[PDB]
Amino acid sequence: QSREIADNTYIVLGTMTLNDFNEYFETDLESDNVDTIAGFYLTGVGTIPSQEEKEHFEVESNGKHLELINDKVKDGRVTKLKILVS
Amino acid sequence: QSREIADNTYIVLGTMTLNDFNEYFETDLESDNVDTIAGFYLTGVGTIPSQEEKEHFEVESNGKHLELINDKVKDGRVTKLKILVS
Hints:
homodimer; 2 helices; 42% strand; globular; Putative hemolysin (chains A, B)
């Protein structure tokens, strides 16, 4: 569900569960009525981004700073995210 | 995919395709990179709504005025919409 593409830089599938995300990244992200990393990102930014109009969401968890950015969007779904760690 | 619940008032599944929606409602809704009515609504409002913080989107098509409102949201997906016609 997650692939390292450069140092501290990853592509994750939007459908990756928050529990799997948290296990991989050693974080503790959570949000009400959210199950997946796309859900967490979308509820955090509050907007359907696009490639032209990317949306960045920054959070801190377990001493890691994460920057989440849309990498692919389909029918209003963020299907891939770029994750940059600290 | 669509159910009449009161006069000129409908509940539609978010996964209803725009082509099926348009056939049912006699409209011509379209948007780039969108396939379903949820995709159209979400790209139009630009925000993940919630039940507490509903989002309304109004459009005109083929002489019909449509008001689209979230009825159910799951993991950032609008899964059901209320549609009010003219």
